[PDB]
Structures are given as C-alpha cells and as structure tokens.
A paper describes a structure:
Here, using functional metagenomic selection, we describe AcrIIA22, an unconventional Acr found in hypervariable genomic regions of clostridial bacteria and their prophages from human gut microbiomes. AcrIIA22 encodes a 54 amino acid protein that impairs SpyCas9 activity. Instead, guided by an X-ray crystal structure of AcrIIA22, coupled with mutational and biochemical analyses, we show that AcrIIA22 encodes a DNA nickase. By nicking a supercoiled plasmid substrate and relieving its torsional stress, AcrIIA22 renders the target less susceptible to SpyCas9 activity.
Numbering used by the authors:
A (entry chain A), B (entry chain A), C (entry chain B), D (entry chain B): -1 to 54
Amino acid sequence: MGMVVEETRDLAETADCVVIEAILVDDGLRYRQLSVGIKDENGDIIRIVPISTVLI
Amino acid sequence: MGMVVEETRDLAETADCVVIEAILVDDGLRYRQLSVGIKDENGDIIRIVPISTVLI
Amino acid sequence: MGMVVEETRDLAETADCVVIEAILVDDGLRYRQLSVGIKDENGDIIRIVPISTVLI
Amino acid sequence: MGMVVEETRDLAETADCVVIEAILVDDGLRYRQLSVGIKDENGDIIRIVPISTVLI
C-alpha cells in the first residue's frame, strides 16, 4: 500500500492494447500516470507498462 | 511537412504493441512525443496512437 | 488536416503572456494542448508556443 | 520492491532546493525520475518531492 490509486480511466483501446490513466495519491500529493496495458486473446490485461507519471 | 521528425526510438516492445518515442522539431523548437504503435500478426505497425508531446 | 480544434480557453493572462488551452480531436481521440501566447504592447498576441499535448 | 534505483545525479542546487535526477529500472525498463529536494538551514535535505517519471 502506502500509495493509493484513486481513479483509473480507459483513454484508448484496441483488440490488443489499451492506454490507461491512473490518478495516484502518495504522501498527500496527486499524480497522473499514463500506462499501456497488454491484452491477451481473452481481452484481459496481462502486463502494465508505465509510460509517464507527473505531479498534478 | 513543416514539422520534422528528427529521431525515433523503441522504448518497449511486445508481440502486439510497442511504445515509441520521437523527437520533433517545429518552428525551431524541439519536442519529445511518446506514442503507442499497434502491430498486426505480421509484426508491422498499423496504427500510431500519440500519448503525449512535451517541449524539451 | 486530420486533427480538429474543438475548444480553446484562456487559463491565465499577464502583461506579456497568456496561457492557452485547446482540446484537440484526432482519429477519434481527445487531447489537451497547453500553449503560451506572446503579447505585444498593443495587447495582441504575436506568437503561440505549444508547451505540451496529452491524451485525455 | 520490483524497481531498482540505478543512478542519481544532482542537476542544480539552491539555498533551499536541489533538483535530483534518478534512473529507475523496473521489469527490464528504464525510467528517468526528476525530484525536488528541500534543504534546511543546516544544508541537509529535509524532504524529497517527486515531480515526474518518464520511460526512457
């Protein structure tokens, strides 16, 4: 724990990949993280590849 | 044209998706663009989904 | 040109500069672009300098 | 904890603040983290505030 995920959002999606946004809160500060999720044949996310996190 | 792609780079790759970086130069300014490329069964990129561009 | 400007907004203004926000839509996805406008003595904007674009 | 700090670097320093850079490696990918360190009267850093992390 320690850091808390407050919100997630699907920004763009494909058969195989999805661009994810998360709002993180750690030690009283708010961050916006953009990630790429990797989907298998069943449409599930098998790997998250964080791309960028920024203070907001 | 007008804007010039100066450099591209593979930051992370998967069977299906790749995280791309490009250095763009437009009107004398330099930008770093992060994108997600969508790959087909043959490993080729069929769609680029820009995620973020920032002045550097 | 593929991308469509859907909204602009004046976020902050100064004697010399103004912070502009735009919502861009390209290939069905929405982006938030922040720019800085340069104002002359006559109160007009003489140059717009894009700072960052991000998928929203 | 999955992610490994591989390099830190002092990019700029001031009476009160110091700009820190770190290279993080997680799941085989490398990230560049920029933080701000807060210095007290005794020249020591009292708080580190992460500003941005990006895949490189």
